[PDB]
Design goal:
It is classed as cell adhesion. The structure is a homodimer. The first copy, chain A, is mostly beta strands. Chain A contains no helices and 20 strands. The structure holds sodium ion (2 copies).
Amino acid sequence: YQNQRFAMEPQDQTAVVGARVTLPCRVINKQGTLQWTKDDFGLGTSRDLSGFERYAMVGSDEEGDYSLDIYPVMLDDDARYQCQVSPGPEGQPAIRSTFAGLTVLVPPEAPKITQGDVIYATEDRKVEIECVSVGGKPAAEITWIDGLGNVLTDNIEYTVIPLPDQRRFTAKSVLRLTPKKEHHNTNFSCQAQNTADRTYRSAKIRVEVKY
Amino acid sequence: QNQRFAMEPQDQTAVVGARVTLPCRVINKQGTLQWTKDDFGLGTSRDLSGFERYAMVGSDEEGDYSLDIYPVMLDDDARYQCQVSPGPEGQPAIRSTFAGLTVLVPPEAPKITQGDVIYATEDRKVEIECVSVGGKPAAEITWIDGLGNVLTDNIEYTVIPLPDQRRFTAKSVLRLTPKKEHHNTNFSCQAQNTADRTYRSAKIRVEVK
Ligand code: NA
Ligand code: NA
């Protein structure tokens, strides 16, 4: 009845690198010691959380509020969190909150076309144009457009390559082009965007054609 | 220079009421040390308030923060890890290997369900049941005749989990065909689990008609 219990428990959240994120935890009739774990690692029991320079427990003691405040968010924060309270002095039972997953989003590097600024093609001599978006979490989507902003979906092969950290991804989109004679000095552009991006980013290449 | 372990805790087995100590020693300790029990943080002060039977023993000088438990209870059966947080200069955290503590529980005294005596009739098939309640693990049960011979035939040994899904009740049934010779003879069961210091016995006398 009077045993310590949660008024609020953390829920899954998603946040971009550099952002602030606060995982809620509030206790009614708090009796034991409160602590957050991160992937089952105890973060510590004092509000300043020494050892973790970007973490602190904020809120007032009177309200039982020990929310885990993270700023700035970094990729290393992508993990499972839990709010815990140890048993009370009279044996009031320990309590453990719902686990809360923090998903951290990472904007990719600027998209780049491997072939550079200009490609010198020959009519009917098939050629590859590769757009690359390095290190996004999640992988960036890539759209191709022609000289007039018409989206292409033909002759395009999109692939994803995980980075060694197994969290970030490099996205690649290959446009296989059969250079028509009219294609001379036309442009092709790729547009890359992941869910961390505020809008898409673009790269462009000019195509020259002989014959 | 990284903080690292000099000693990590290993799996141990202990009987309820015993003292058990899980080693953890740190070299170049920079961060704060803490134990977890089934991923619950036990606290970062040596007296571990909130856990009346736990404390971290050893000297700071030796980097020793072994988890001391006394008296051991069934609730201690769990997986433990020794953790040290990042240091002031960014020395990375360390986590020990996990150590499982297996707690053993002696069963209650064995009992024969038919009790003190069986008044039987010749060739009228009868069953004698020995029961050992509440052992972790389940007690093994051996049947012996009046001469002290282990009976290995006509025996059904079963194990039933208890409500807490940790302790077990062991039962062993001996199928007997009453014979004139079996008059006023004795049957004993001997029950023992790994927690027991020795076996415990119950005895039944059988009369034939
Ligand atoms: Na901190
Ligand atoms: Na304690």
